[PDB]
Design a binder for this molecule. Structure first.
Ligand code: CHL
Ligand code: CHL
Ligand code: DGD
Ligand code: DGD
Ligand code: PID
Ligand code: PID
Ligand code: PID
Ligand code: PID
Ligand code: PID
Ligand code: PID
Ligand code: PID
Ligand code: PID
Ligand code: CL
Ligand code: CL
Ligand code: CL
Ligand code: CL
Ligand code: K
Ligand code: K
Ligand code: NA
Ligand code: NA
Lengths: 151, 151
């Protein structure tokens, strides 16, 4: 057990209602988030590859395992995993983020933002309960503060 | 140095002319290869996650590093990496494939095939030199025999 695991449980309280409202079977997620821009996207994918090579290999292993278990507990019409697996996944991802330098994480966020159309967040939010999405995000902000403290 | 590295060099002789003919900047690769079928695709993605968790963590690390280096040497109008980086990537991927049980690799191939429209290989091949694609594939068959012997 660790502090990221404790923080993932609080994050789940704040975010699982949002998770249940996303339609994870929507084909939209395979689309570019705006105009397809292969050269810019490749730069973002490169920042991710750099980060994956920097990440602790045992923690990437554990984060993959957690996703395989989450897939096994999917149910209902939106394809949402169990509450327990939602928290497990978030904690395992938090540990991966904490295993690399902060600049590597920001480089991914910046490089993806560059290819992401300004309308995309609002359109995503419009398909769920707005208050639940806001509560999820304030949850994320509290969680990332625990993650940073392990980083 | 190892036998997979030697085999990757022969594979490059057989396949790099094909690599140069693919338009890696074509947006088509972001499309589902046929009808989008999220439940079946998730099963294929699950076989991959299982395989990634089973793979040797040092070899997955090295395979990511090899891709970051390959991205740095991209040139020309099709976005093709250098011959040296093409071989490096193939050897590092060969080592990853050899680090997991054969059944895990076949499970991915079967689960992806299930969502892949029968027209897709021929359409892909139609955008390149057919003889070069055939020479690439016969190269692959020789390479996978070396990979299997390390497996
Ligand atoms: C079928 C498998 C599968 C699916 C469908 C997804 C889906 C996703 N992954 Mg995951 N992953 C999957 C397998 C795996 N992933 C990962 C490792 C990662 C990493 C390292 C990351 C992702 C992230 C993401 C998200 C990227 C898009 C995004 O940011 O949306 C928005 C995100 C959500 C809807 C997820 C919940 C986030 C938050 C706790 C609550 C919601 C807050 C806000 C309302 C919206 C988000 C705001 C931003 C600024 C944080 C997306 C939800 C990324 C992500 O979520 O970025 C924030 C991310 O950083 N995945 C591994 C390797 C261990 C997997 C397999 O093993
Ligand atoms: C920008 C980054 C990036 C891009 C564009 C790609 C693109 C691709 N990856 Mg790669 N990857 C990338 C980063 C990374 N990959 C991987 C790990 C993997 C793995 C483990 C595998 C792929 C494979 C593939 C291919 C999947 C589709 C396919 O099978 O087409 C057809 C494939 C090609 C055109 C590639 C050349 C194959 C062969 C040597 C020559 C051509 C033979 C035939 C003519 C066509 C293929 C026949 C099939 C039956 C083998 C595709 C070419 C898969 C693959 O190639 O399956 C065969 C695969 O197994 N990637 C990692 C983690 C280390 C990456 C980042 O770090
Ligand atoms: C070949 C196939 C390969 C596939 C490759 C696929 C990967 C790339 C696919 C792209 C997917 C991107 C779409 C993501 C949208 C989700 C982000 C979002 O809604 O974000 C919403 C935010 C909203 O903006 C924020 O809005 C906030 C509002 O807060 C206010 O309001 C809050 C609650 O309402 C609180 O009150 C809070 O305290 C208060 O300040 C603040 O103003 C912040 O400053 C501001 O950042 O937008 C922002 O961040 C702007 C930046 C958004 C850019 C995207 C960021 C995602 C980075 C994640 C990296 C993952 C990469 C994707 C793939 C990885 C999978 C492994
Ligand atoms: C949210 C975003 C997340 C993104 C997720 C994305 C991943 C999934 C995206 C799907 C991409 C799939 C499209 C791939 C097409 C390439 C395969 C192909 O052209 O294949 C061509 C072959 C042609 O068929 C073969 O044709 C051969 C012909 O050989 C003959 O001819 C030869 C030379 O002409 C030689 O002479 C040879 O000796 C002689 O026998 C033989 O008959 C073989 O038995 C027969 O298999 O088709 C076959 O195999 C049929 C099976 C094809 C199924 C696809 C196989 C790919 C499996 C790779 C796993 C990678 C998964 C993809 C993503 C992974 C990235 C990490
Ligand atoms: C081989 C293999 O398994 O690889 C594995 C690799 C990983 C990394 C482990 C993995 C993973 C995680 C991944 C890829 C996550 C990807 C997330 C993608 C999110 C995409 C989104 C939000 C896309 C869009 C597109 C939208 C378009 C919106 C608009 O166009 C619309 C409607 C109309 C316009 O008028 C206005 C508009 C509003 C602009 C939008 O609103 O959102 C996975 C899945 O496991 C597969
Ligand atoms: C060896 C091997 O196999 O590697 C493989 C391993 C993987 C994992 C499968 C793999 C992969 C994918 C990877 C690395 C994905 C990485 C994702 C990174 C996500 C980062 C995020 C969300 C960062 C942020 C930063 C944010 C900042 C927000 C704020 O600053 C803002 C704006 C304003 C301030 O006022 C307050 C603030 C709130 C602070 C934010 O909100 O989010 C890959 C590439 O395939 C390689
Ligand atoms: C088709 C289908 O059914 O798919 C199903 C597939 C599944 C897997 C079963 C499934 C599921 C679950 C899923 C997808 C869960 C996704 C979770 C994503 C979690 C992401 C996390 C936590 C990302 C971050 C990024 C962080 C960055 C933090 C920092 O940068 C920040 C901000 C500010 C810096 O100053 C400091 C910092 C510390 C660097 C962080 O702290 O955390 C579901 C729902 O069932 C759908
Ligand atoms: C070949 C093939 O078929 O592969 C298949 C493989 C799969 C895995 C099966 C597959 C899949 C599934 C995938 C990747 C699913 C990804 C889901 C990502 C979902 C993202 C969502 C919800 C994003 C948001 C962002 C939002 C932002 C809200 C806010 O910012 C807003 C507006 C205002 C801020 O002030 C406050 C805020 C509240 C922060 C929100 O509310 O939500 C797919 C697509 O089927 C393809
Ligand atoms: C966060 C992050 O970085 O994730 C990283 C995760 C990884 C795994 C490391 C990674 C990687 C590798 C990946 C995903 C490789 C994906 C390969 C996809 C190949 C897709 C293909 C061939 C798609 C199609 C679609 C086609 C459609 C054809 C047709 O419809 C057409 C024309 C008209 C119809 O009449 C007939 C038809 C003929 C049916 C086709 O012919 O082909 C990457 C890139 O690094 C990103
Ligand atoms: C911890 C962590 O981070 O994990 C992350 C790590 C990654 C790597 C980034 C990641 C990923 C992606 C993964 C695993 C991709 C795996 C790809 C597997 C490819 C397998 C292939 C091509 C298999 C085959 C089998 C074939 C057989 C052909 C033949 O039998 C046939 C028909 C007919 C016979 O007569 C002759 C024959 C010729 C023998 C073939 O032709 O091809 C993931 C999911 O994101 C997790
Ligand atoms: C937009 C843009 O510009 O992107 C650029 C991005 C880059 C990265 C810079 C770039 C590049 C290079 C790329 C993509 C290279 C891709 C290489 C893929 C290699 C895949 C390999 C070897 C897969 C396998 C699968 C195998 C399976 C083998 C077996 O199953 C078989 C058969 C039969 C079983 O009985 C035994 C077995 C042993 C189990 C194997 O042996 O090998 C490029 C071109 O520049 C494009
Ligand atoms: C959000 C966002 O924008 O992300 C962006 C991220 C990126 C990385 C920048 C990006 C990208 C690039 C990607 C994934 C590229 C993937 C390329 C895969 C190419 C596959 C090809 C060529 C497949 C084939 C299959 C063929 C088969 C030929 C044969 O079988 C045939 C007929 C007959 C057999 O008898 C013999 C045979 C000879 C075997 C062939 O000849 O070729 C993209 C798309 O821009 C999206
Ligand atoms: Cl505890
Ligand atoms: Cl571009
Ligand atoms: Cl040698
Ligand atoms: Cl389906
Ligand atoms: K509101
Ligand atoms: K021919
Ligand atoms: Na470690
Ligand atoms: Na090892």
């Amino acid at each position: 057990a660790d502090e990221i695991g404790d923080a993932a449980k609080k994050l789940g309280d704040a975010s699982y209602a949002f998770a249940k409202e996303v339609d994870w079977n929507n084909g939209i997620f395979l689309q570019a988030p705006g105009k397809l821009q292969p050269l810019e996207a490749l730069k973002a994918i490169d920042k991710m590859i750099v980060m994956g090579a920097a990440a602790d290999p045992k923690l990437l292993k554990a984060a993959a395992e957690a996703h395989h278990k989450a897939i096994g507990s999917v149910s209902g019409p939106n394809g949402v995993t169990s509450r327990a697996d939602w928290d497990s996944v978030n904690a395992a991802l938090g540990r991966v983020i904490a295993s690399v330098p902060e600049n590597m994480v920001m480089d991914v966020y910046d490089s993806v933002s560059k290819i992401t159309d300004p309308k995309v967040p609002a359109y995503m939010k419009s398909l769920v309960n707005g208050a639940d999405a806001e509560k999820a995000y304030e949850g994320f902000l509290a969680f990332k503060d625990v993650v940073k403290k392990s980083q």
